[PDB]
């Protein structure tokens, strides 16, 4: 009635006030500042290694901490741990649910995490005494499909699901110590800060939210994309992040002045982005489109500097090492490739 | 070979054994049939599932062939984000119970359950990831349909229909209005079947349809196509 109308109205002018406040803090654009610096040249990168052995579509890969090992996930029902130098196969792990969407590698190197389309997140122990890799934990409690997972340390993990929720979990405890709610559409991705204090998540309602691990609260909400958000990640400096979407566009968002930084889009591209990642200095941004090939843009000038065209199907996952030594791309043709 | 230490050769050996186990594992996965199950709710989906025997799974064997059914009823998520995971399945099985036109779903007294089932079949049949995928349409709970139809002609849900209100003409009309929804007609085939809750054939029907799909796939592999 009158109370409902007045409270909905009040919500409306508060949304208007927040919009006016982020408009009122802008006085310049990134491109105007950055157009002067000399552009990097053509980034000619060749396939120095080709990892083969998956028999189906690949959705997830994650680099190791030393910048020599990595892990990958496919619909075959297998997780695989690789040796990037000698192209050896270090580990091969089965799964109980073939329908996986994400995997992650512990920052120490003792555990890995896998999950998707089952409402679970499983934790496996690599460096065991017994010689094998075995399941340590079955985190349960979401009501949608699990879209992403990241290790905070050896005991804390943060998950985002399709039922519009994010959560923080304590692997030893086996239960959620914080739930982050407020997305209307399905949440598709999340990325952790360099120092593990804040994390961003992006969802199907064309928006992203910044969260406080300790406070379990939505500090900022970011909008501007016309469609879904497929992938997200921080800048290495920890004060910006990059969003990949389903309307053939990539975007950069700041945290301190929560605005739009830059947009990366070309008219010849009309397909969807599946992954983004950053460089060691944050000078190059890698985007994996599903026009079968990857693009390497200037993360500072919104130009195009190179292409990684060696795949014969949809490019799903993508990653960069901790030192900058290589990049790795996976795809729906079941082949992983290392570029230098 | 000549540059590798005594410890590197053992690592190469381990990687090779992992390779052979991956290859052996991925071949047994290609001797099984993938069927994706859809329906409008209590459309007899559960009853066909109990007839043949998170995301739910079912496994069965019949005359030396292994079938897998992937039931996605309870996902309740945005379907466009998880549907392409089934892009390469063998068949779709779509269940609708044909005595469910007078009784309307709790959502609406006016928009009937048949209109919702029509929306579902239309949306699935023209999906971009299923342009070469065959569909098996089960029409369930037939015996009750005569009791429900003799009290009121199909005009409630089929006002533009004219018939003496016997089971044969009514059910046949319903089937027509179902298979006319296809928009491929050249790279897709639809197999329709009328059955009650209990049966002694719903299993042979799927065997036949999948045998047909397999033989066509083989002939396409030849190039004799």
């Amino acid at each position, epitope marked *: 009635g009158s109370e409902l109308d007045q409270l909905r109205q009040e919500a409306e002018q508060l949304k208007n006030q927040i919009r006016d406040a982020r408009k009122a803090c802008a006085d310049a654009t990134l491109s105007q500042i950055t157009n002067n610096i000399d552009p990097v040249g053509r980034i000619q990168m060749r396939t120095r290694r080709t990892l083969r052995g998956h028999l189906a579509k690949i959705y997830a890969m994650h680099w190791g901490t030393d910048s020599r090992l990595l892990v990958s996930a496919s619909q075959d029902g297998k997780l695989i741990i690789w*040796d990037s130098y000698t192209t050896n196969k270090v580990h091969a792990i089965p799964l109980r649910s073939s329908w996986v969407m994400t995997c992650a590698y512990a920052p120490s190197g003792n555990y890995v995490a896998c999950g998707g389309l089952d409402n679970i997140c499983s934790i496996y122990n690599l460096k065991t*005494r017994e*010689g094998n890799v075995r399941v340590s934990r079955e985190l349960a409690g979401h009501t949608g499909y699990l879209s992403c997972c990241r290790f905070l340390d050896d005991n804390q993990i943060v998950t985002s699901s399709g039922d519009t929720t994010c959560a923080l979990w304590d692997i030893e405890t086996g239960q959620q110590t914080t739930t982050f709610t407020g997305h209307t559409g399905d949440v598709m991705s999340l990325s952790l800060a360099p120092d593990t204090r804040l994390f961003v998540s992006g969802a199907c309602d064309a928006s992203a939210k910044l969260w406080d691990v300790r406070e379990g609260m939505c500090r900022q909400t970011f909008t501007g994309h016309e469609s879904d958000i497929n992938a997200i990640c921080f800048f290495p400096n920890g004060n910006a992040f990059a969003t990949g979407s389903d309307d053939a566009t990539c975007r950069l968002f700041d945290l301190r002045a929560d605005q739009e930084l830059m947009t990366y889009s070309h008219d010849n591209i009309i397909c969807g982005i599946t992954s983004v990642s950053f460089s060691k200095s944050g000078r190059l941004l890698l985007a994996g489109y599903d026009d079968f090939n990857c693009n390497v843009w200037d993360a500072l000038k919104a130009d195009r500097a190179g292409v990684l065209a060696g795949h014969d199907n949809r490019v799903s996952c993508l990653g960069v090492t901790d030192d900058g030594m290589a990049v790795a791309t996976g795809s729906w043709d079941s082949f992983l490739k290392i570029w230098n | 070979g000549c540059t590798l230490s005594a*410890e590197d050769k053992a690592a190469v050996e381990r990687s090779k054994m992992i390779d052979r186990n991956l290859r052996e594992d991925g071949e047994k996965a290609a001797r099984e049939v993938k069927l994706l199950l859809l329906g409008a709710g209590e459309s007899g989906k559960n009853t066909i599932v109990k007839q043949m025997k998170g995301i739910v799974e079912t496994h069965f064997t019949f005359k030396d062939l292994h079938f897998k059914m992937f039931d996605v009823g309870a996902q309740r998520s945005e379907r466009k984000k998880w549907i392409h995971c089934f892009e390469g399945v063998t068949a779709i099985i779509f269940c609708v119970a044909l005595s469910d036109y007078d009784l309307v779903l709790a959502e609406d007294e006016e928009m009937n359950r048949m209109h919702a089932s029509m929306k579902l079949f239309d949306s699935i049949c023209n999906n971009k990831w299923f342009t070469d995928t065959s569909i098996i349409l089960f029409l369930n709970k037939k015996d009750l349909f005569e009791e429900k139809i003799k009290k009121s002609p199909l005009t409630i849900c089929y006002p533009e229909y004219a018939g003496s209100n016997t089971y044969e003409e009514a059910a046949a009309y319903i089937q027509c209005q179902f298979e006319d929804l296809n928009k491929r007609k050249d790279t897709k085939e639809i197999y329709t079947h009328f059955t009650c809750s209990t049966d002694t054939k719903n299993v042979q029907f799927v065997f036949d349809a999948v045998t047909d799909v397999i033989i066509k796939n083989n002939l396409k592999d030849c190039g004799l196509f």
Partner: single-chain antibody
Amino acid sequence: VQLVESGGGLVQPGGSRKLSCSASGFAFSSFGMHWVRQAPEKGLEWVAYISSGSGTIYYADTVKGRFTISRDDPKNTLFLQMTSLRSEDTAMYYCVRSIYYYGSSPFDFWGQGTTLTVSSSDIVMTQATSSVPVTPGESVSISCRSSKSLLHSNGNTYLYWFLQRPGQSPQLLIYRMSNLASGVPDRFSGSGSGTAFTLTISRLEAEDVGVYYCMQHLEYPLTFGAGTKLEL
């Protein structure tokens, strides 16, 4: 985890004998197996190697064609078979497990071995010192040398340090001449360069006394040094 080994005894010089270890508590079918021999009041010597999948087999140059190793993964049991036993085959035998992949720690668990008595080029590693007296509470150092450079081109340095406390079996202390095995205190360390290396201990403890050994693993055969005893 454990590798209970059996098969020893006294043997006439002309005769056959088998030595079988049973592995319980781990994935035995993913572990290269070795036999390493030690002589009474002497050092120890490598014997033989069989890898994961029965692909590569290696024998010591002094045992060729007269020893035979064998594996059984369905029941996790490994054998060695002997037919010609000269008087210098009286020793004890320790069966060691190891696994090879990037970051692995070979020669990790050791077992207990069995004692067999008999009726009466290669890199060289030598431990010049035979006994360093010391009282608890200060630094101790032991030095080992090789006939050439053990730093392989790939970057590794296949030198191992390991200990035998008086009255029991050995256990790994340092693998690849710098890295510390799991389950031992940080009292121990190992440094070196080229062909000269030193094991070192900072704080001595009543459990730290033992006989210390160095090994290289660059190529075959695997060659030890002498046994450097410590006394209180």
